[PDB]
Amino acid sequence: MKGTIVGTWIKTLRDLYGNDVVDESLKSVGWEPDRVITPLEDIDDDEVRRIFAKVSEKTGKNVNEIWREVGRQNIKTFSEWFPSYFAGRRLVNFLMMMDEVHLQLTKMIKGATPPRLIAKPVAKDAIEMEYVSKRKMYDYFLGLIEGSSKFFKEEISVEEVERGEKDGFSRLKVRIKFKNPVFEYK
């Protein structure tokens, strides 16, 4: 996982569950409890798993609920740390640029495997967005969508159309419906 992003997760976990839980979880994988992950670093997916496993153990929450909560809260973290991605945008625009943003932010990484997040309009008031990744981070994806709606103060309903693995990739397709019309024919 890209280092910059794992860094946001550590801060988000502190915001959700407190410094004791995070410090102890980080120690349990042999990190300094105050470690600062730099943009010159990546973190092995399995270390992240082990950290989150420890958070689940300590909080008594299922790890899927943790990812869902982290996904919701991490939008706030992103908006504070990387404000340029939110500046002067609405929710639909933000969601539709995510696929490209994830390519752009992992370009420089050898063997990069960003999630794909292709969105396409399917109605005046709806888009379809499909999460595709080897990583199976469904609750995180859903949480980020929920957090995005909160941050942009734009009400949406999220219909989970299909979820499952295909050709080695996990895939989750959702239909996101906006309370008020967002597109027009042109």
Ligand code: HEM
């Ligand atoms: C400013 C906002 C955001 C930034 C800067 C950002 C950036 C990133 C980066 C760099 C990664 C690491 C990918 C890798 O190492 O392969 C990542 C992971 C991920 N991103 Fe974002 N992201 C943002 C918002 C979102 C949103 C809105 C969604 C979904 C709607 C999303 C979905 C995901 C998911 C599900 C992962 C986990 C990796 C995986 O499942 O393969 N992100 N993000």
